[PDB]
Design an enzyme around this catalytic site. Sequence first.
Site, mmCIF file in Angstrom:
data_model
loop_
_atom_site.group_PDB
_atom_site.id
_atom_site.type_symbol
_atom_site.label_atom_id
_atom_site.label_comp_id
_atom_site.label_asym_id
_atom_site.label_seq_id
_atom_site.Cartn_x
_atom_site.Cartn_y
_atom_site.Cartn_z
ATOM 1 N N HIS A 1 0.826 -1.222 0.000
ATOM 2 C CA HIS A 1 0.000 0.000 0.000
ATOM 3 C C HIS A 1 0.844 1.249 0.000
ATOM 4 O O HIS A 1 1.788 1.384 0.784
ATOM 5 C CB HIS A 1 -0.930 0.047 1.213
ATOM 6 C CG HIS A 1 -1.883 -1.098 1.267
ATOM 7 N ND1 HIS A 1 -2.588 -1.529 0.161
ATOM 8 C CD2 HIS A 1 -2.228 -1.925 2.280
ATOM 9 C CE1 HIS A 1 -3.325 -2.571 0.491
ATOM 10 N NE2 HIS A 1 -3.130 -2.830 1.773
ATOM 11 N N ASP B 1 -2.902 4.631 2.893
ATOM 12 C CA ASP B 1 -2.777 4.583 4.338
ATOM 13 C C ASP B 1 -3.316 5.860 4.974
ATOM 14 O O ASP B 1 -3.900 5.831 6.042
ATOM 15 C CB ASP B 1 -1.320 4.362 4.740
ATOM 16 C CG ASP B 1 -0.973 2.884 4.937
ATOM 17 O OD1 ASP B 1 -1.439 2.033 4.160
ATOM 18 O OD2 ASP B 1 -0.224 2.584 5.878
HETATM 19 MG MG LIG Z 1 2.616 4.626 8.335
#
Ligand SMILES: [Mg+2]
Lengths: 202, 202
Positions: free
Chosen positions: A175, A180
């Site tokens: 990711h 995030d």
């Molecule tokens: Mg982080």
Amino acid sequence: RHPMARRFRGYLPVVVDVETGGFNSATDALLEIAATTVGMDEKGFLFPEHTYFFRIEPFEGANIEPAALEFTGIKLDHPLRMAVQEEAALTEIFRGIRKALKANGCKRAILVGHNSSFDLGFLNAAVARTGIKRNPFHPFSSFDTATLAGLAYGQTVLAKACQAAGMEFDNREAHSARYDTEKTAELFCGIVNRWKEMGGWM
Amino acid sequence: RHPMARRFRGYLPVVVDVETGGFNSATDALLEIAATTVGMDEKGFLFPEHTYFFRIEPFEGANIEPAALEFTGIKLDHPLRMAVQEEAALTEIFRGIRKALKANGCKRAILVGHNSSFDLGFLNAAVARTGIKRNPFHPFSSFDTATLAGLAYGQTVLAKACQAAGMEFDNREAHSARYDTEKTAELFCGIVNRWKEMGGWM
Ligand SMILES: [Mg+2]
Ligand SMILES: [Mg+2]
């Protein structure tokens, strides 16, 4: 005072996540940075507003731990990486943050993050390297979503916290800072909003 | 399973505050450490339980900023300072925490502090200097009461957070770790307990 200014004593929450070439902020490369500002709606509920996201060209002389880089899945020489210099990326993010501070009557941003002191240290180090002035973030305090998720859900791991909160989150491992930061902003606003819904901010 | 073990995923919150010779955990002296374990009562409410406190002899080679000493009121050569080697203090604290872990069915301690990353950084640096292998604390996760107070009271400053909570906090002239630890523990328990009162943990 604008409603958002009253909520955290004049700090505007801005969610930031970084990817790095290791765990040492003094020496290790900054490789990605995402930042997501938070707004307050007419009913006093927080929501994620705007996302900035840049892939970063490692600063000259930076340290990159080979295993660290490998786990991030980042490909430094990929022709579509579209990496920019850290000063250019910070300049653009800061500009956007300062505009948001003015729109919300706020005096400074406060970094929001999962294990947020990690991101703040890297951010402070990049600011120190570039010599950028008027850093709009608080240099030392931050809102830790691992702490908020501990309270709200009894979970400190990001994926498990989001799962507990009813959000989708992928156990893919690969990711970008953007994913995030958006998930963390949703986790942050949901916890603050639950606190309000439960009678905590009247 | 124990109810405390279920609250934070097997981690026992333990409040820690340090006094130091400056802001750099790599170089600056540890001068005091206080730690307060938290317990859970029969009704599921957290309370501050066991306290440990030691004044610390500066490690050989440590930096002590003149301004740190003015801020804290610390007198290194005072005949009743009763300062001890950091290795002895940590060993005693860690032994006490392990006992708390067992009594709460927990596997590790999680540091709680106001701007908790600061205190975790100094703890880890002292653990590294001393070579202690039996450290019961998580090395990177902490619970930040600045974050918690931001949520609950909109306040990031410890004194102001306690005042918003309805606690007495003395606008003191000498900063103490025993005092900040006691108040931080109350602050922490109060916010976790409020979450529960509001229907957040059933
Ligand atoms: Mg982080
Ligand atoms: Mg402190």
